[PDB]
Structure 1
C-alpha cells in the first residue's frame, strides 16, 4: 500500500505538473472544512497490489 494515487481533485492538472497537497476535497454542495465526512474523502488512495 506504499503507492498512492490522487483520486479526487477540483480541476485537471497542467502538463508536467505535480500535486502533493494533502488537502480534503469537497465532492458535494456541502463544504468539508478540512474534516472528513459525507462526500469528503482523502484524495490519495493506495493501490491494493497483490
Structure 2
C-alpha cells in the first residue's frame, strides 16, 4: 500500500509537472469543506500490488 497514483484532477498536467496536492476533488457544485463523502473524493488511490 506504499505506491499511490492520482486518479482525479481538475485539469490535465503540463509536461514534466508533478502534483503532490492532497486536496479533496470537488466534482459537483457543493463545497467539499475538506471532508470526504458523496461527490467529494480523495484523489490519491493506492496501487495494492500483489
Normalising by structure 1, report the TM-score: 0.89
> Please, what is the CA RMSD of the aligned residues?
0.8
Unmatched 5+ stretches in structure 2 = none
Q: Which runs of no fewer than 5 residues in structure 1 stay unpaired? A: none
* Equivalent pairs, count: 50
Q: After TM superposition, which residue ranges in structure 1, 4 or more long, deviate above 4 angstroms? A: none
TM-score by length of 2: 0.89
Larger fraction in strand: 2
Instruction: Give the match's secondary structure for 2:45.
Output: strand
